[PDB]
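quick one
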Amino acid sequence: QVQLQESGGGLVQPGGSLRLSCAASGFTFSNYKMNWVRQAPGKGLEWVSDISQSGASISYTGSVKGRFTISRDNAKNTLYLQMNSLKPEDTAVYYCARCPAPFTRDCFDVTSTTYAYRGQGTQVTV
Amino acid sequence: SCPLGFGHYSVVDVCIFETVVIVLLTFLIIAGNLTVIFVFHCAPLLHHYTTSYFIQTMAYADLFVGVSCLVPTLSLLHYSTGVHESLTCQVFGYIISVLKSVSMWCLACISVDRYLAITKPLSYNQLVTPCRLRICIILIWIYSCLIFLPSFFGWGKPGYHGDIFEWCATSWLTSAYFTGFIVCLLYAPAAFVVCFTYFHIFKICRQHTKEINDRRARFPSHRYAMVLFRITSVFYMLWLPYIIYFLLESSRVLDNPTLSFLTTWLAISNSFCNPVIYSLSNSVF
Amino acid sequence: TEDQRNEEKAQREANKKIEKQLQKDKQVYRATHRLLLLGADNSGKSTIVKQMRILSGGTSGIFETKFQVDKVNFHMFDVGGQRDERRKWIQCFNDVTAIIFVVDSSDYNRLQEALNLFKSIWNNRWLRTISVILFLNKQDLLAEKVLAGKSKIEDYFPEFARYTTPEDATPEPGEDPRVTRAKYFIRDEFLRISTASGDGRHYCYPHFTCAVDTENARRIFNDCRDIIQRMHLRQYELL
Amino acid sequence: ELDQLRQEAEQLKNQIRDARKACADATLSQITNNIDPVGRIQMRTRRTLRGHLAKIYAMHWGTDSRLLVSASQDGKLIIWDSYTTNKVHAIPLRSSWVMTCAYAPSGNYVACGGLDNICSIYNLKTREGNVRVSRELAGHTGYLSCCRFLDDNQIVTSSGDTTCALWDIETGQQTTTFTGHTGDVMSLSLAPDTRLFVSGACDASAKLWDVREGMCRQTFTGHESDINAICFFPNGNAFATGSDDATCRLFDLRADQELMTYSHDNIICGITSVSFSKSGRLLLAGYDDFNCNVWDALKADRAGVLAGHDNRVSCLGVTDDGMAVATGSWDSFLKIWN
Amino acid sequence: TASIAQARKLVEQLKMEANIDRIKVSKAAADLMAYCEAHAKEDPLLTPVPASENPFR
Ligand SMILES: Cc1nn(-c2cccc3cc(Cc4cccc(C(F)(F)F)c4)sc23)c(CO)c1C(=O)NCCO
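structure w/ EN6:
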């Protein structure tokens, strides 16, 4: 089964730092581009960051590129997001999202519906 | 005229070196045109619905060029006649002249079709219809037949193709007007429209390449049809030596038989183009 | 035998009738140019449809807009009946002449969503030969947002402070240089997505359009002309 | 009881996974190592069927193994005689975004549907002699992906609204609705006894459904991406799936787990269509690398290749007697192979 | 009651893998092999036939 499991979260003082870890099982990790998405309370899902298959190509959203650091461990089949200098706008539910097809540079991961290759999610409060 | 030198030509057919290059070249034309005839009609995988018909007419006409140039030249060794070879010479010369004319005008129509595709792209399929295409092919054949018809009624020799027979090479002569006048009214429009269409295609390519390179400089960041563009130009500037010799004789003092043979030998070998169009494009099959 | 001869020649003449009908249908199909309208709810892509309807009939969810620009027929399809996931039904539009992309440029919160949708369309395997005609809608709302303040682009895009106007390309739509820098920064975001990939097979055609703009049909005509010219120039020429 | 319910559901998942791994430890590949291989399968394009203006998504064979129907997004539904390459019928469609077509096993009706969210049933045998639309089935809220006729009055449709549906044709009402997929359902196949049908969706899962009971018996996972094509093994106790992870898989119903994986290192594009031969020894799959692969279904080796299409292979069909394979593609041509 | 329906689906899976039957461990694989052996020579694709009884040739 294609499973993504998020770990890390909880209360943190503003300006803190967290390390969200997404464990991936049921598929080859190296062949898929990975994303971090979040859903603010009373708001829709918005994409935060994405990292390529090897990990070389990396991009972030308007939440500053300096605060957040995405990385991936293809040997460990896991996806890390290092969250620095937390602001109260960062209170959201965070999802690691595999984008659907391998060997692709296109990904469709922020659908409100039951997008299959998204984790159950973790809560970050700040 | 024999480069080795066999004396002046007669019914004896002394210099067979003249014949063998013709026979081999027309054999290659027959083989290549038979192959291209087989490959579009049996397996039209890439067709494009407009250039296919004109290229098909080219392949048919060029295969008939090869057959109608190989059969008399091969037959000259076996069967030779002293009488009734004259009318045979006008018939052969007219046939070869008309067939080369329809091949040239078919590439001219490729040129104007590509110009209509570039210049009026959104109304292109409205403007050209397969009924108009078939009408264009029919008037190509009719026009080529009607231009060279006065060679039968006695306005002069239409071309140097029929020089393989003895009597046309010596006695029958080109004329100044209605030969190189009506005949140039046939040849000059084809060269004009090919040059015009490629000039406009290169102007459009200049504008689009300018815009693309300007945007690429603004943002620093990380095969079958292509053959047709070059080989038509190769075809037309291969037609030029025969046209230059034809005009430069045109019943005036300049006359060279070796230049005649070489120039119309190139003018016949330009029928290599249609097999070369498919051979360079498709390494696999 | 004889009755199977009757049956087979009746089958052949039925095939001939079918084939002449299909060649008429081929002429009608080649006469028209098909566009895929795509965008979001905040973008006024339904409004631009209303200008080409001047210059809800569709009850199947998908919208059809037929408009006529100088004896050329354009059929634009707005897909609305489907879900939010669009992986599979976007593959039906590979042979579309151009994707019309409509962006709300005043709203900055969903600009990144539009950029990501543009990137996914641009890098898709079945859409990598389709040029995109980009309409940046509600440019009048963009001007009132930047001049009033309190909604800074720098909050959503931290590289706007390090950006200057490229050459002051067309100052007449946006008079004040702040408005010009804002709209040209958004345009450069979409075109730096466009120029990163795509080996000359397709290009973006950005425009700055208002809500009451009435020349979008002519813009689509000119961009489609350039698309077909570039396709022919790429096909039989390397250049 | 929220923690108790989550613990119960996780224990249910672990229990069924352990039940699958304890049900069988052997594989069909180690069972069939003694079996002689099929060898090279050479198939030739016995016919080329031309006449579609645009790309083709769907075809369906008739039960006579001679007639077939094809759907293309130029707006035409063309019924072809494969023996003599004659176009028997050409139905113009109201919506030109058709994605599926089904030919009724009696031969009297044909079906189509697509982005219009409507299944159109066209009557072929009419007294006036020219085909009209018999029924217009509306009620799905997404595009229609696949439809199959149970008989002349029952139609089953998979849609992009994550649901399947059994409709009674003459009354135009959804008799049964099959829910449980979370992604867009892309394909369905009917069982030989037409009591069951499987359906694969974009959630990398396949589901077996009872037509009369209206609920899902079994769920099959193992794919890593969207499932584009599903097909029963001819016995009806197994089925194969093709998906976007460049992999085909063979599952058995009674064992409720995957028996084989058909993939190779050089194959990276997804599978668009799958089908079985009449015996079930050969599994044919259409790909996005523009050709089809014939697989030995009992040892998972690439037995043959069907190259000959200039674009991706969208549909693939095998006759009831198994004589020929028809392959459609985005290059607007069908090909009949033996 | 989507969660209740999914939980009951998992319950139904537990009921099915409670008692399928007392079978051989690789019996389903043997069933597939037996079907492909039993319908082997009747396949036109697997066993090639001359062009007399093949209407596409
Ligand atoms: C054979 C031959 N050539 N010649 C020539 C002498 C001087 C110039 C030319 C120019 C020619 C034009 C041409 C060139 C290439 C293909 C063709 C084609 F149309 F036939 F294909 C035509 S032929 C020829 C003669 C005697 O005039 C003879 C002959 O009478 N007997 C045999 C030889 O000893």
